[PDB]
Amino acid sequence: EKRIFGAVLLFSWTVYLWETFLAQRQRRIYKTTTHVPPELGQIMDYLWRLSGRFCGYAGFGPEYEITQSLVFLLLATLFSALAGLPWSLYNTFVIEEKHGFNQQTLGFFMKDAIKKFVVTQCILLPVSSLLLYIIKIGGDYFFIYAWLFTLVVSLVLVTIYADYIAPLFDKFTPLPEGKLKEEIEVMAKSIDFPLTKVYVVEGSKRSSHSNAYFKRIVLFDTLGCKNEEVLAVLGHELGHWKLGHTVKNIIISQMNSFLCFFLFAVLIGRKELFAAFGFYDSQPTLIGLLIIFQFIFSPYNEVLSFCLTVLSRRFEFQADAFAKKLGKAKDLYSALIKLNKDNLGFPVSDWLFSMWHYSHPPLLERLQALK
Numbered sequence: 553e554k555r556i557f558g559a560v561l562l563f564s565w566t567v568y569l570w571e572t573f574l575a576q577r578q579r580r581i582y583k584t585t586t587h588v589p590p591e592l593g594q595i596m597d598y599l600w601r602l603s604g605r606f607c608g609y610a611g612f613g614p615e616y617e618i619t620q621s622l623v624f625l626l627l628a629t630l631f632s633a634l635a636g637l638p639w640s641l642y643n644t645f646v647i648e649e650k651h652g653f654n655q656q657t658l659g660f661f662m663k664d665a666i667k668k669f670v671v672t673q674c675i676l677l678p679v680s681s682l683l684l685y686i687i688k689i690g691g692d693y694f695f696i697y698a699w700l701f702t703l704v705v706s707l708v709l710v711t712i713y714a715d716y717i718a719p720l721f722d723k724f725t726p727l728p729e730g731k732l733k734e735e736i737e738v739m740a741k742s743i744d745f746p747l748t749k750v751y752v753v754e755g756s757k758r759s760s761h762s763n764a765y766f767k768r769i770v771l772f773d774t775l776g777c778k779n780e781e782v783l784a785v786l787g788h789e790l791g792h793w794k795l796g797h798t799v800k801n802i803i804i805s806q807m808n809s810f811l812c813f814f815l816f817a818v819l820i821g822r823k824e825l826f827a828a829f830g831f832y833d834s835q836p837t838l839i840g841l842l843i844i845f846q847f848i849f850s851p852y853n854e855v856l857s858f859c860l861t862v863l864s865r866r867f868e869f870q871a872d873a874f875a876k877k878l879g880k881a882k883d884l885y886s887a888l889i890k891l892n893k894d895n896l897g898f899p900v901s902d903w904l905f906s907m908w909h910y911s912h913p914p915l916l917e918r919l920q921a922l923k
């Protein structure tokens with residue numbers, strides 16, 4: 553039990569020191585690189601027991617484990633929401649305000665935060681009661697049904713999100729008739745993309761930052777770029793579809809989900825895993841998920857994150873190359889420079905920090921490839 557606890561905590565500190573090291577190398581570049589390089593002249597000018605206590609003053613005794621688990625889920629997410637709030641306010645209303653990006657008031661910010669928290673609970677708790685029940689009621693192969701249920705939930709959520717969740721938080725409007733709407737339609741036909749409707753999301757209610765999303769096409773209103781540049785960026789986006797990157801990501805995530813539920817099944821009988829974290833008299837299923845998925849699986853989670861980051865960089869070069877294929881390299885080149893400027897991206901990075909962290913290859917590497 554001591555080896556387990558100690559190893560989780562030492563791994564945490566080790567990752568933290570590695571990431572502090574990397575961050576320092578990147579911060580050094582910001583303080584050091586004080587004029588435009590020549591490669592760039594043309595590019596820029598306890599809680600558990602507390603939850604039981606709430607349960608028993610409402611008339612629910614310890615035998616009601618899922619109930620206590622749902623209380624814990626509420627308090628844990630509330631605690632994390634509350635401790636994140638000072639930081640999010642400072643980033644939005646000091647950093648983002650200072651550099652010209654924030655567009656929202658404090659009242660919008662708090663309305664938004666409460667709504668996101670409520671909607672999260674509306675989905676999280678019912679789904680959690682069922683998943684926990686499934687785990688309890690189906691071994692020795694419970695993990696197959698646990699996996700299948702999370703796959704179905706994931707599928708439902710993704711299928712309803714556009715119509716039923718997203719409009720609670722953002723304003724979507726059809727792209728107006730004009731020259732851009734028609735060239736998008738031409739391009740979509742050209743690749744057999746069954747384009748249905750083009751929408752514009754009013755991101756400017758929040759921020760002047762811009763970002764294109766991956767059926768329907770949704771474009772930020774802050775995306776700005778002239779029409780031929782929007783089209784090359786769409787060309788790139790549609791490359792993620794033609795090349796099957798989205799399907800590969802879905803398969804990876806469900807294979808990973810299968811593997812973790814299997815290993816959870818292997819490990820969840822080990823009472824030493826619970827004792828490591830102060831659970832002596834009981835082994836609640838949810839606490840089990842927490843310990844195994846977040847603490848015990850720690851090294852695997854880190855290696856996989858890193859592997860997905862490398863893969864992501866590879867997919868981005870491939871999507872750029874698909875837009876080149878479509879004949880849009882010159883416009884994509886232009887588009888990436890202008891978005892880098894509107895969003896104030898700094899186009900020099902430390903090679904180690906960027907290898908570890910960047911899901912998108914540095915701008916200069918993307919421009920060279922488009923040439």
Ligand SMILES: CC(C)C[C@H](NP(=O)(O)O[C@@H]1O[C@@H](C)[C@H](O)[C@@H](O)[C@H]1O)C(=O)N[C@@H](Cc1c[nH]c2ccccc12)C(=O)O
Pocket residue numbers: 761762763764765766784785788789792864868871887888891895897911912
């Ligand atoms: C051609 C480009 C305008 C659109 C293109 N979008 P795309 O790569 O297809 O997809 C984006 O990146 C993926 C990693 C994510 O999984 C997606 O959710 C999405 O954020 C892109 O290169 N996005 C980069 C570049 C970028 C767009 N807006 C930004 C704002 C700040 C910094 C960088 C950007 C990004 O996500 O960052």
Ligand SMILES: CCCCCCCCOCCOCCOCCOCCO
Pocket residue numbers: 565566568569
């Ligand atoms: C006995 C092994 C310690 C070797 C690695 C040092 C870990 C330091 O990271 C701490 C960073 O996080 C700040 C909060 O933790 C402070 C306590 O760290 C003391 C490490 O013994």
Ligand SMILES: [Zn+2]
Pocket residue numbers: 788789792867868871
């Ligand atoms: Zn992309």
